[PDB]
Amino acid sequence: MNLLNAAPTPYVWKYNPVTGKCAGAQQNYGATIDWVLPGGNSFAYAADEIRRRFPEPAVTRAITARFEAESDQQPYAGPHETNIITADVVRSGPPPSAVYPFDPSGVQRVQLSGGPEMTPDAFKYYLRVQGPSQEVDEPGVMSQRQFMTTFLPAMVPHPFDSESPDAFPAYFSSVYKGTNAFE
């Protein structure tokens, strides 16, 4: 076969979760096959076939999304988590069935050792459930699952020959030319 037409090894991405910004992509050397010397002619075609059967990014996105749709640790509570999120707020605070006396006497009041307005249960749950005031993400920062659904490992044949896109190792392009920077 001719190796100029060989399917390139994919570019798998690097995430850097601590910051959350993308940390670049690498040639997928971590998963590759030793075939040129020992495999010879019969395994050159096999390796090319394996490389060109690498899933296109949309398929990888779908598989990853289906993978973390079965996690059990979604960012938001499912029925299992919200059942016990509701269970305590229903049983939190002063009991609703407690018939405690109200004594509006200016002299000679009761002691109320215990243990007249009351908050509704719906509002009680609303306090526990309400999210932040941000409600909008930061540009460039994304979560691990969010980063894996985007930034998909895919073959990039003939990457470094276009007009002026080059690549994203660890950079920020500002001057209309690829300036891999933050030196």
Added chain:
Amino acid sequence: YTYEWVLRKDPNMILQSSLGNDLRADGASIIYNEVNLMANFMPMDHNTS
């Protein structure tokens, strides 16, 4: 909540000298008899707490 802790009994650690001499060799010692845990609770209304 169960909340434990451990207190140092080392005389050099707990006690500070104006000379920095060895207090273990100089008869210093400590005995803890009662060690309680104080706490202040704000009596805010239960409907508010």
